């Protein structure tokens, strides 16, 4: 298991434009297109992103292209973040992927607000951090996903993803 397989499990893969859990226009492997309610605006962003006339749809290879780009951005993001970097550098591999997972899903700015969880993760207070992590809109809105990620932070293993 690696970050790509992990995210693939959490985001699924859709070739036509879809509304995500928050009702936002997205496609591929959780590639957010736009926060606006406009399908056309989403269609525009899709074309701009792919660099061709797609008319709301893409291929698997293009999806994977967005995907590779998005994963890289999250990492680069974390590494550039004053608040995220120290935590990220402090984690073992497996746990680091979980941080990437959250950033991919919510953005670096959103994750940077889990101040207390962040500190706990920094201190290696696994169980304590898992509890704090659960006291969030994140967990209340996407419970099964949030559970997998928290379990990962708690155990340092891929178990939450085994057998899926
Ligand atoms: Cl969920």
From Swiss-Prot:
One of its GO terms (biological process) is defense response to bacterium. Changing residue 117 to V: 50-fold decrease in enzymatic activity. It comes from Enterobacteria phage T4 (Bacteriophage T4). It catalyses: Hydrolysis of (1->4)-beta-linkages between N-acetylmuramic acid and N-acetyl-D-glucosamine residues in a peptidoglycan and between N-acetyl-D-glucosamine residues in chitodextrins. Endolysin with lysozyme activity that degrades host peptidoglycans and participates with the holin and spanin proteins in the sequential events which lead to the programmed host cell lysis releasing the mature viral particles. Once the holin has permeabilized the host cell membrane, the endolysin can reach the periplasm and break down the peptidoglycan layer. One of its GO terms (cellular component) is host cell cytoplasm. This is Endolysin. It is found in: Host cytoplasm. The active site is at residues 11, 20. Changing residue 20 to A/N/S/T: Complete loss of enzymatic activity. Optimum pH is 7.3. Pfam families: Phage_lysozyme.
